[PDB]
Amino acid sequence: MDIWYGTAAVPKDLDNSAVTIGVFDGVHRGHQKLINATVEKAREVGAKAIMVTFDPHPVSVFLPRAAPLGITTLAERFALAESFGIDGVLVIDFTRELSGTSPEKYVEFLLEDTLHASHVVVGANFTFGENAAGTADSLRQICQSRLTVDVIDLLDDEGVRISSTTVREFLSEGDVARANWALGRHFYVTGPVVRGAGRGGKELGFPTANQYFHDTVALPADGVYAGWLTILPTEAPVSGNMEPEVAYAAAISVGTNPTFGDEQRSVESFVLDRDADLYGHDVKVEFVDHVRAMEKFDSVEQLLEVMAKDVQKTRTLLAQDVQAHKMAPETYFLQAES
Amino acid sequence: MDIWYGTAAVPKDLDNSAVTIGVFDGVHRGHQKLINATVEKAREVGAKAIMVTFDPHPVSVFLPRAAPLGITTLAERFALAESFGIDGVLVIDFTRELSGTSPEKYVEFLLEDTLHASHVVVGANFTFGENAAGTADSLRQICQSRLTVDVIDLLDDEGVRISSTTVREFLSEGDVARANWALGRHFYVTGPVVRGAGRGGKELGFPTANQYFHDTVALPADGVYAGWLTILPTEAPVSGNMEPEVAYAAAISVGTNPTFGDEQRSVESFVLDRDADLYGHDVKVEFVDHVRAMEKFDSVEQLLEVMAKDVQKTRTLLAQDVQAHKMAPETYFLQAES
Amino acid sequence: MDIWYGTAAVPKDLDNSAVTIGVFDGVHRGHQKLINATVEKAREVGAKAIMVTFDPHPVSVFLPRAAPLGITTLAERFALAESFGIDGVLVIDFTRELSGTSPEKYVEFLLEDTLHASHVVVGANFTFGENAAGTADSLRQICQSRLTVDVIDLLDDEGVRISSTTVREFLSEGDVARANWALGRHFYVTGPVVRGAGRGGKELGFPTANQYFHDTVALPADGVYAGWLTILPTEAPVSGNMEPEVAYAAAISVGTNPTFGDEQRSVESFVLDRDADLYGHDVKVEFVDHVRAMEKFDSVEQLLEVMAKDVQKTRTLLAQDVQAHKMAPETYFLQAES
Amino acid sequence: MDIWYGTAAVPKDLDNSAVTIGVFDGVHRGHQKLINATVEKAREVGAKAIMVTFDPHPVSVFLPRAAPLGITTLAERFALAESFGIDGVLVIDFTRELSGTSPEKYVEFLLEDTLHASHVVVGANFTFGENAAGTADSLRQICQSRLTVDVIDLLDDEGVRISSTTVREFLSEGDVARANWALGRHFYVTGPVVRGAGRGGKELGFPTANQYFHDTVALPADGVYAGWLTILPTEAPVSGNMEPEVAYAAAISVGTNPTEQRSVESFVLDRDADLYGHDVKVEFVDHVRAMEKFDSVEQLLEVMAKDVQKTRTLLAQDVQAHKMAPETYFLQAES
Amino acid sequence: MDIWYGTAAVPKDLDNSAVTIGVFDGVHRGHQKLINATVEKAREVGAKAIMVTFDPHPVSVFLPRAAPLGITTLAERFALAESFGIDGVLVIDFTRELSGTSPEKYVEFLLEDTLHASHVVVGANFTFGENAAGTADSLRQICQSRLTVDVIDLLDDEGVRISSTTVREFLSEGDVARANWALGRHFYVTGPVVRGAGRGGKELGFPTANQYFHDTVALPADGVYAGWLTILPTEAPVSGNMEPEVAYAAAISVGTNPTEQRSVESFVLDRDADLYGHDVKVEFVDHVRAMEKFDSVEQLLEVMAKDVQKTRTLLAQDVQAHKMAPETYFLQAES
Amino acid sequence: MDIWYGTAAVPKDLDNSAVTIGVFDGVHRGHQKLINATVEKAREVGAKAIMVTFDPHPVSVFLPRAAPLGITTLAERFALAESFGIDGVLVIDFTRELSGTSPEKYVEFLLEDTLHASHVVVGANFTFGENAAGTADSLRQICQSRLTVDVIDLLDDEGVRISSTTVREFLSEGDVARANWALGRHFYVTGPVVRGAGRGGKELGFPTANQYFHDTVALPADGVYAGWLTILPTEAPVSGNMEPEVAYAAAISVGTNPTEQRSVESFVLDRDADLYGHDVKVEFVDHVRAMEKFDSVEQLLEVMAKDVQKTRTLLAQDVQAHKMAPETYFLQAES
């Protein structure tokens, strides 16, 4: 999959494409409709399936700091776009171009001149051009006889509108199950593992892995979650008895340190039945279900007791998750008990 | 109008004065009674009307950081004092003088030796001297046969005591209309315009002007207000179609950035029907009415829609404000519609 | 009293001891049972009474930053241990030793090899060894025929469990009276006096003393308390009419400054009927009773009036405290009135 | 004078223009040659004189955290352009447009489509387009018989190249005399006066005015300088015996205070005033001495009386030579 | 290769081992002699080759805020150990164990009880036990007929002592050639690429990749260097014309930005790419020039074209001599 | 000894006094001449000896962020005044009073109305009143037949002017020997001991005591010094083999750690102790060596054993000459 930053970077010799346009934050089940429709049509006519997306978030152009939290990083957006069969991602920066352009010149410049589009696919909520004047309707009118438009209704399922907004609200509430339901996969973050307390190994209280994330990263509410931890492919040695590319049952504590801001979130994972230290490795953490809210501990005894209940509850939740195997990892490690 | 910092700076040859004494923060309608009475009496006997005020705030001398927010800056206090006909402002710093003095020596030193007063005007809540021992009553007793005292009752109107305290509560609540009512004018801040997002001009989402204020500045609660933006007299060129000294209809967003403190407040003004960038200019922003609370936006479309409703509501509120012309600006710009 | 940091620092020639083991934070009335039982038994057999305690807090080993607030500093723990007749304190750092040891090797290494114990005294909630496996029960089993164990039930009195946890909750609530009740003494902090506002002396609004404490220090909720201020023995001159080693009646304001963190707490003491400045001195502040919540002041007059009510209420509370003379200071200064 | 942010803000009905192009930081004597040629030309052929300038600095596009110090603010650049009779300033942001463009397109789009220029004026060092391919030469042909180019050599005078760089060098070493000579005027900063050390009045040690400036602002080296302070036009009252729009003799101490951040403290000669809240312009005439620490009141006051005598002399000299002296000023011969 | 944190993590059933002991920071040519002797020995006598190393640095135990810069991360130390055929790394933390121990106990506990070693290999400068009483000598006797000691002298070559210290010295002065010669390989750092100045593509001035490093990381002096950049194995897509696992010629600018903090910005020769989000390895070949400030686009681009020509030459040279050159690389002869 | 903050705190019934006036920072040998003359005089004529001093420093009134470093704290200044037999200290804050006053009024108000002085003692460099008009001369007349003035010349000894300035110079360069000679005693700091590197005990590398000081506190240059450490009187238990009120030989490392901030770390010779929570006084005797970085445990311990031998010698020397040595001390001849 190609990745182009700005119209100027798109190959001039590009001859034909089917194009979809959106922020696509989270690439949720609604987003997958647009992508699927686009990949289908590109296949039919032997064109390339192109996603036009936006970075920075279009909102943050007008309101820096008051931008929506990113359900996925841009990099993960790319990987997800690829995994659903996008051939090329064009990334538009509204501080560079396509901001003040009229709806007409937008179609002319982006869809025709830049992309050589024969088909365009948008959601019914799509807008474009200066002061968001252009709508799904405009696009259909301007594109008459020039290229075909397919406008897809927003996805409603089980009484919930599936959008980036709702996914963010679910995550913020700590309801990763409903977020996963809307995403069509386990919500996850990826990142390098750093040093924490310990000495991950024999000690049940020291995390198997510690990660930190900037405050633009959407993460579930502080608390403990059941999930899966996967060491990403690597040749580097692994301290302990965990193997790369296997999803390991884990109780996950999401926290907020600050006093400082960057209001930095931590993610601390206690991997069930394994003694490992993951420092320096790149690790994926998938969230499956909420287990409990955060609480303060006043003795090691109380703390470890609670830690043990987390593990028990996690084992239960994950044993269930494996049965919903469209969500579950291909290769996993979960012991029936301790 | 003269401005003197400390008793020592007052001209020795000053021969006669009518004096009023208070913090005078906000110079509200109650404060105007004291000032009016003082200016009247000074006119009668051909004396000078003197305001004795305090900086730093007397409270902050005992409780730094826990001082009341300043309804106006000291500089604006001066301008307002002048506008009601004060001839001289004496500024007392309680960390330098007049702090430990007995009520008797206070009258002797300040009113007689320093100011050569023949008339003094205070509010019924006035205190003075070490540990606030002296009252309106004391002042009348000590001044017997030495200079006349006029004690003015605190202003009650429509069931509300008009004081700095109540004005601050109204502002804090976001109720600028009642604050204006108590002030006897539109509450306003003044300050240099800096760079924000954009590029103020054709784009409706980029503010016409961005200003920042330190956290000692009283400002209304975060939200959107209808108000008027006036470029203060200047020879410097103005980017766009706004002229100096004209009050322009504006929707005003008051915000709080931090994470850092100084808990710095922002003020972002969207000037109705104008395309201008005000960087480097000195700008007055008068608040007229609350429009809505702050909210997070998840798409440019949603944001601009809301921005448009702000403008509609602002136009309505301001069209009304012009009719209460004792509050309204002399020269203004308000279009009937877009 | 000896103080040893780590097992290695304990004299090899130590021949016999009676040992108690716990965090002992606050040395509350429950803690005093363990200490009393231990000192008694050590007296009987002519052994030394040894406290084994922990620093850092065992919780913070697993959860740094999320550690319980310290009811007393380590130094005060030592002084209190001494005052109840402990001969030696052994301080264990769980990041250095005794963390991963089995229950069996813990008894063998710590109680026998290191301490030459003939008697050990723990609370029924005691745990030890890797992953807190060992309990009061384990200890009794492992120690069979090797040294005697005495397990003391947790202290319940007036329907309240007396533990570090409950003391912390009382303090956090601002209920120092119940905290004192559980501690068996007035809760107190000690620290150097620094400069504040003023000029402690004739001015009633300037504190007699200002102290700051780091955010790991447990302190009552922000507000005003009645208490006693004692200048610790010193040869350094004292500005004003307070003498060293006398407990002086004081109204105490506990505050939180930040914006910055270290979320630093202040303690400002207004000593009744005295004019003194305590800069540079080391001062103990004992808390006796809650007087009022914190509030913002908008005039010096209002502030001083409230200050006067604080003093009146304090005089009342302290006059009562003197009658409960098991709590009260040996040598005190309290005037019947102003 | 109009100010346009980006090509899109330019009036579509712009008939005809004479254009000059550059960063124009400082608007020094070399810059003034370009503007003069442009203004003289435009007034002749009926047309508007346009300056195309850049913000942020083209260097800062590639080297954030490594951009040259602003000799003047962008606001002062506008004011200086207007004073030399420019009719419109077009401000180009290289992160938005005109950056990755070819030389060929840059000309047609900017000079032709946007500005409809008959005449362009650039300095011999002018570069443009993608990776700065376009040069003083590129320009003269690419504009064949459409618009009349005019290249002006960089200014040498007294063996010295006059450029933004040399001005920045002169300032950096505290040689304000040479900076001014290159600028064609007193170097100045403008800013709101805040509270600082004590209160301005009878005391010689408390500054008449205190100002702070961000670290993007070029200031002379830390030290004391002779200069003039002006209260900008205002109806706000002035505490003390100073009125607006008169340049008052002052000794000026420039200090650094990390964490930015530069300070400017003005001791106005023979005045008792406190200028808190006013906007104030401070012009630098000549360097007086380096910064130094003090450990007694006597010593500090002694040196400050020397600063004052030194300032009187240097400023009296500035009044003769006359060319850069203020129109209305206040300078006493004696204390 | 196994990694054990503390003596307690070592498999109790560890039959027999050949052990080497040291900080091993940088795993330089002197270090490689120790590992070689250890690995060759262990493969012979059926046994496992073990490295005992230290984290945190033994100096940092006594001098926090004053610890020497890490030539490599602990993670890279593991990777280097494994590449030279070490079977297990035992990481000792002196704040937890082995610190206040006598020389006598250190041997029995670590080499005997924990590691069950028949053979130990240390450098002639080896010290241990309480207050470093134990030395190269202490070791040879205390291990009498139990385990066969083997002391190796520090490496001198070309009149130069090869040690972590001299490597740190070479890096500090920007002499990467000498650092590499002492290391037996190109010095490198590895890190996630973040966003920085602009976007990597057609523009020569926007870096292909931007990385920041904490102040514990040894980096060469601020300046420009010739080097190779490798995208580490990945299935993530790559924006632009670069694939993973090929070393691409690059000019590398190393910068400092307080408050830590070092930056590494790579301008990959003859490529248009943006490597945001990828893990990237940057090897340093030779110093090109010191850091310098710029005040025009032309100037900055001019110097950067010089950096590129200079890099081509130096890297072509690195391809001959051959011994440290990358296996798979990309280097064009001409622009 | 009484302490009065401001003229208003002085007992109205103050009958008669001999007064000395100055900053008195450090209370050095020059200062001691003033106090001696004042104390000897007052004990004679039945009266109280008064010191008028200043806080904040008179320089800091005009130059905030530029005030000279305190040779001692204000608290230590009180303690030193008392030790030389001053009966009352009057602390004047120039932001509150006595600042913009004329010379004439300063005398009548301070010396006459407030202090009711018969005798004043100042140094030949004394200045006062508005803009320091009043001088050693001004004083002798303005006090005509009311109160007997007495001016004392600044102390020269061994070709050296003894002043707060020269003391600050001596400290700054790390020459504590000369500072002490000028002070008439060992320079010292006093402070609460906190936790730092490791735990104080058997290990030579972990300091017996760790202290930090704000940047207003004058400390010797970064380096190692020979000195004495005293635990101030206390009933709090002491971990280890040290008792209060005995000066123990120590090697003292002074460090800087931005962002203030100075550190003082004491390695007490031949003791195993940890002094956390105690108030501790540290006296500086002689400079031993400059600061230096370490990169091995052996090296660091080696140098520290040298520091110890060096300290023993220097401190044994301090015990002879005798004049500044502590009354009760602990210094072993050998390890």
Compute CA C19 distance to the chain's CA centroid, rounded to the nearest angstrom: 21
What whole-number distance in Å separates Cα of residue A269 and Cα of residue A284? 11
With beta carbons under 8 A apart, name residues in chain F contacting B8: 100
Say which residues have a Cβ less than 8 Å from residue E239's Cβ, sequence separation at least 6: A2, A3, A4, A5, E200, E273, E274, E275, E276
A9 and D CB contact within 8 Å: no
3-state helix, strand, coil in chain A (%, to 5): 30, 30, 40
Whether residue D160 contacts residue D182, with contact meaning beta carbons closer than 8 Å, is answered with yes
- Sequence positions preceding breaks in chain E, C–N over 2.5 Å: 259
Say which residues have a Cβ less than 8 Å from residue F181's Cβ, sequence separation at least 6: none
Chains D, F: CB contacts within 8 A come to 49
Q: Which residues pair with D4 in a beta bridge?
A: D90
Which amino acid is present at A323?
Answer: Q
Specify the pairing of strand D209-213 against strand A247-256: unpaired
3-state helix, strand, coil in chain F (%, to 5): 30, 30, 40
| Selected residues 100-159 of chain C with any CB under 8 Å from a CB in chain F | none
With beta carbons under 8 A apart, name residues in chain C contacting B125: 299, 301
**CA–CA min distance E93, chain C (Å):** 10
E59 and F CB contact within 8 Å: yes
B7 and C CB contact within 8 Å: no
Cβ-defined contact of A95 to D100 (cutoff 8 Å): no
With beta carbons under 8 A apart, name residues in chain B contacting F95: 95-96
Whether residue E283 contacts residue E248, with contact meaning beta carbons closer than 8 Å, is answered with no
DSSP symbols for F76-118: HHHHHHHHTT-SEEEEE-TTTSSSS--HHHHIIIIIIIIT-EE
What whole-number distance in Å separates Cα of residue A141 and Cα of residue A45? 23
Say which residues have a Cβ less than 8 Å from residue B150's Cβ, sequence separation at least 6: B37, B41, B119, B120, B121, B122
What whole-number distance in Å separates Cα of residue C22 and Cα of residue B61? 47
Computed over its alpha carbons, how large is the radius of gyration of chain F?
A: 22
Whether residue C52 contacts residue C152, with contact meaning beta carbons closer than 8 Å, is answered with no
Cβ-defined contact of C63 to A197 (cutoff 8 Å): yes
Tokens of A181: 């339901």
Tokens of C270: 């207004």
With beta carbons under 8 A apart, name residues in chain D contacting E301: 131-132
Specify the pairing of strand E279-290 against strand E223-231: antiparallel
Which chains contact B through at least 3 pairs of Cβ atoms less than 8 Å apart? A, C, D, F
Q: What are phi and psi of B115, to 5 degrees?
A: -100, -15
Task: Give the nearest chain F residue to D291 (CA atoms).
Answer: F66
DSSP symbols for B221-286: PSEEEEEEEEEPS--S--EES--TT-EEEEEEEEEE--SSSS-PEEEEEEETT--EE-TT-EEEEE
Cβ-defined contact of D95 to A100 (cutoff 8 Å): no
What whole-number distance in Å separates Cα of residue D276 and Cα of residue D234? 13
E68 and F CB contact within 8 Å: yes
Residue E302: count other Cβ atoms within 10 Å of its Cβ.
Answer: 14
Q: Which residues pair with F156 in a beta bridge?
A: F161
Q: Domain locations in chain E? A: 1-186, 187-330
Whether residue E87 contacts residue E49, with contact meaning beta carbons closer than 8 Å, is answered with yes
Say which residues have a Cβ less than 8 Å from residue B330's Cβ, sequence separation at least 6: B247
Chains A, D: CB contacts within 8 A come to 7
Compute CA B318 distance to the chain's CA centroid, rounded to the nearest angstrom: 21
β strands within B35-186, DSSP E: 48-54, 88-92, 117-123, 127-128, 134-135, 148-152, 156-157, 160-161
What whole-number distance in Å separates Cα of residue F20 and Cα of residue F33? 10
With beta carbons under 8 A apart, name residues in chain E contacting C97: 96
C-alpha separations of F137 from A201, D302, E195 in Å: 81, 17, 70
With beta carbons under 8 A apart, name residues in chain B contacting D88: none
What whole-number distance in Å separates Cα of residue D234 and Cα of residue D247? 14
Q: Single out the residue of F110, F221, F231, F122 nearest to residue F174, CA to CA.
A: F221
- Resolution of the experimentally solved model in angstroms: 2.3
C3 and F CB contact within 8 Å: yes
The separation between the first and the last C-alpha atoms of chain F, rounded to the nearest angstrom, is: 44
Whether residue F254 contacts residue F222, with contact meaning beta carbons closer than 8 Å, is answered with yes
What whole-number distance in Å separates Cα of residue E212 and Cα of residue E261? 7
Residue D159: count other Cβ atoms within 10 Å of its Cβ.
Answer: 5
Q: Single out the residue of C79, C80, C111, C110 nearest to residue C96, CA to CA.
A: C110
What whole-number distance in Å separates Cα of residue B95 and Cα of residue B97? 6
Cβ-defined contact of D96 to A100 (cutoff 8 Å): no
Task: Give the nearest chain B residue to D5 (CA atoms).
Answer: B199
Tokens of D122: 């650039």
Q: What are phi and psi of D10, to 5 degrees?
A: -75, 130
Buried/exposed D164-186: b ≥16 CB within 10 Å, e otherwise: bebbbebbeebbbbbbbbbbbbb
What whole-number distance in Å separates Cα of residue B260 and Cα of residue B281? 26
Q: Which residues pair with B227 in a beta bridge?
A: B250, B287
DSSP code of residue B203: -
Compute CA E320 distance to the chain's CA centroid, rounded to the nearest angstrom: 23
CATH homologous superfamily for C187-333?
Riboflavin kinase-like (2.40.30.30)
Cβ-defined contact of E296 to D59 (cutoff 8 Å): yes
Which chains contact E through at least 3 pairs of Cβ atoms less than 8 Å apart? A, C, D, F
With beta carbons under 8 A apart, name residues in chain A contacting B298: 59, 68, 164-165, 168
Cα dihedral F130, F136, F138, F142 sign? positive
- Of the residues B63, B165, B167, the best mutation for testing chain C's interface (the one with the most C CB atoms within 10 Å of its CB) is B63
Q: Single out the residue of B165, B166, B147 nearest to residue B20, CA to CA.
A: B147
We find that the CATH architecture of domain E1-186 is: 3-Layer(aba) Sandwich (3.40)
Tokens of C272: 């009744």
Q: Which fold has domain D187-330?
A: Elongation Factor Tu (Ef-tu); domain 3 (2.40.30)
If residue F330 lies in a helix (H) or strand (E), which one and from where to where?
strand F329-330
Say which residues have a Cβ less than 8 Å from residue F137's Cβ, sequence separation at least 6: none
| Selected residues 188-207 of chain D with any CB under 8 Å from a CB in chain F | 196-198, 202-206
Technique employed here was: X-ray
Scan for tokens 């296997």, then name that residue.
Answer: A246
**CA–CA min distance F243, chain C (Å):** 12
